[PDB]
């Protein structure tokens, strides 16, 4: 069928749209960036549509019958609980999106009367009625850019609050015990970055001859069939449910995961949607089992030898043994048609890598630098144009994203973060006087709540002491940031270093948890180094939550 059919009627924003920040005509750094940087608006809502639209065919075979035979069979291992309505709610982001009915998210939080007797409704809806399409809204998301010409608009499809909060009431407990108990190891959001380098280097050295590659599928939500959705709900199935939960999954699948009406911001009839949803809370987790059972088959089907898989929603790696050049070049062409019968093409062909460094996933890539021993110490990082290009669209139009902060907390290693992030952002908040102020921070479907001042026991949970010590960066990663603050029109790396021995002073002179600050998160910007301990706070915090899929858009609340 069709991923999408269209009215014709637009794709409108509810909010102001800014392509571009505006000009000063008087600074060369202001062209370069106005050069480079742009943000994605709903006028090119429409090309992203005409990308996104295309008919699926799906042809299954005995290797994905017995992938899925044993994805089933894992999944029977699962016993899920309903959450209550308070459960729900207490996971509802403080600003998700209000509901058509008069309330908002701050209504769901506490319990008002309206909000709960309308969710008690859409519930009740949900358990009577099996079939009839939940209506969806379409918008075009407003993300910050480089270029190299310009990517249309992502668009989000999603149900109304009052439906968000029943999804987690009926699905929130599987999201968090299933996608482990049938992937193991391969689940991709059970680690920490630190774990996950960890799992890669492990996956690496078991082979006696390894070979890696990456594989990204063209537009995997719009690659999701009606009956790839209906398998997944098999596989929810297969878990212990109490009865009154299996009613509400099935209606979900058939009246909303698999498909139903858009609408747009104004009210109109848009289109109708036969594909994967990007804002339900099954669209991450959905992503990630469909990814792993389409991959192991098409390993099965191509003769891909001893593979290891990990798999973040649509981005997937495989570490095998290679079987020599030519033939892994034939292995991935048999895998690449396999996935292609199975509805999951490529963007771009997978290509074989005989170093675990030349391989992107996530927009990552696995670096070396030295730890304070002069021991070689591996990390992940990314090229940081595109990350410091949104951190300086959100220091002059503040964002609830705060893409900064989530990129401190996962590039913690990184000498852009360190040097450049690190910098800007201490040096904001002590001006601003607001480095106690708790924060969210928007990534893969999750809000989390940070306070800055707790980001050194956080980067030491998340990263290890190691992050505090790495210094003799790979030259890659020097020329990656040297190039990225010219292209935007920065300071460049010198600037910073001085910026930080300033920072670092500043904190210093603040006492208590910034003065912590100060020495662990700047001790690469002074001479005399002072000898980093672990900090007793590490082993307290509670990151449990911080190791899960969450809800497309994003709708699951950390705090
Ligand atoms: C570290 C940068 N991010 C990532 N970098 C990555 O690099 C790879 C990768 C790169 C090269 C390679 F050869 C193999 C794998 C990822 C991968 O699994 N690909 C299949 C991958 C995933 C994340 C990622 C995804 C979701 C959440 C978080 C997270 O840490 N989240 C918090 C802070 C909340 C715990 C991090």
Redesign the pocket.
């Known amino acids: 069928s069709m991923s999408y059919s269209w009215t014709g009627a637009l794709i409108t924003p509810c909010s102001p749209e800014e392509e571009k920040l505006p000009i000063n005509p008087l600074s060369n750094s202001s062209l370069r960036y106005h050069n480079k940087v742009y943000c994605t608006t709903s006028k090119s809502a429409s090309q992203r549509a005409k990308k996104v639209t295309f008919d699926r065919t799906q042809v299954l075979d005995a290797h994905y019958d017995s992938v899925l035979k044993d994805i089933k069979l894992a999944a029977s291992k699962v016993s899920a609980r309903l959450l209550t309505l308070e459960e729900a709610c207490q996971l509802t982001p403080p600003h998700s999106a209000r509901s058509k009915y008069g309330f908002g998210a701050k209504e769901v939080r506490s319990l008002s009367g309206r909000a709960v007797n309308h969710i008690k409704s859409v519930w009740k809806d949900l358990l009577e009625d099996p079939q009839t399409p939940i209506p969806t809204t379409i918008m075009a998301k407003n993300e910050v850019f480089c270029v190299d010409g310009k990517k249309p608009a992502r668009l989000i499809v999603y149900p109304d609050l009052g439906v968000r909060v029943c999804e987690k009431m009926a699905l929130y407990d599987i999201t968090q015990k299933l996608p482990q108990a049938v992937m193991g190891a391969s689940y ?2 059970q ?3 630190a774990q ?1 380098v960890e799992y ?1 280097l492990k996956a690496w050295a078991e082979k006696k001859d390894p070979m ?1 590659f ?1 594989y990204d599928t063209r537009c995997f939500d719009s690659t999701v069939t009606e009956r790839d959705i209906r398998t997944e709900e098999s596989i929810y199935q297969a878990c212990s449910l109490p009865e009154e939960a299996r009613t509400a999954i099935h209606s979900l699948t058939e009246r909303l995961y698999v498909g139903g009406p858009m609408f747009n911001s104004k009210g109109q009839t848009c289109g109708y949607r036969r594909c994967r949803a990007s804002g339900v809370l099954t669209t991450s987790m959905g992503n990630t089992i469909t990814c792993y059972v389409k991959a192991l088959a098409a390993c099965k089907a191509a003769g891909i030898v001893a593979p290891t898989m ?3 929603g649509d ?3 495989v ?1 095998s043994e290679s079987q020599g050049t030519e033939e892994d070049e034939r292995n991935l062409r048999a895998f690449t048609e396999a996935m292609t019968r199975y509805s999951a093409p490529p963007g771009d062909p997978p290509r074989p890598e005989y170093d ?1 460094e030349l ?8 670096s070396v630098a030295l730890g304070p021993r002069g021991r070689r110490r591996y990390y ?1 990082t ?1 090229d940081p144009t595109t990350p410091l290009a949104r951190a300086a669209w959100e220091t002059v139009r503040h964002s609830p994203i705060n893409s900064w902060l ?1 990129n401190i ?3 913690a290693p990184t000498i852009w973060v360190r040097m450049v992030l690190m910098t800007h952002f201490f040096s904001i908040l002590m001006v601003q006087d607001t480095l106690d102020q708790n924060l969210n921070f928007e ?2 479907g ?1 809000v ?1 709540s940070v306070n800055p001042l707790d980001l050194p026991a956080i980067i030491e949970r ?1 990263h290890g002491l190691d992050a505090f010590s790495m210094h003799t960066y790979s030259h890659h990663e020097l020329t990656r940031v040297a190039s990225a603050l010219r292209k935007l029109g920065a300071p460049p790396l010198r600037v910073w270093k001085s910026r930080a021995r300033a920072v670092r002073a500043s904190l210093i002179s603040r006492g208590g948890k910034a003065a912590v600050c100060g020495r662990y998160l700047f001790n690469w910007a002074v001479k005399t180094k002072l000898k980093l301990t672990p900090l007793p706070e590490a082993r307290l915090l509670d ?1 449990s939550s ?2 899960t899929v969450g809800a497309g858009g994003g709708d699951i609340f950390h705090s």
Not at 359 to 366: H, K, R
Request: some cysteine; hydrophobic content about 45%.
């Open positions: 991709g959001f680690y920490s970055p996950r890669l890696g990456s990990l798999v973040c981005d997937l790696v570490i675990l391989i992107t996933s996530c927009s990552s890539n696995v992940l990314r989530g907390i996962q590039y990534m893969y999750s989390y998340l990151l911080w190791f």
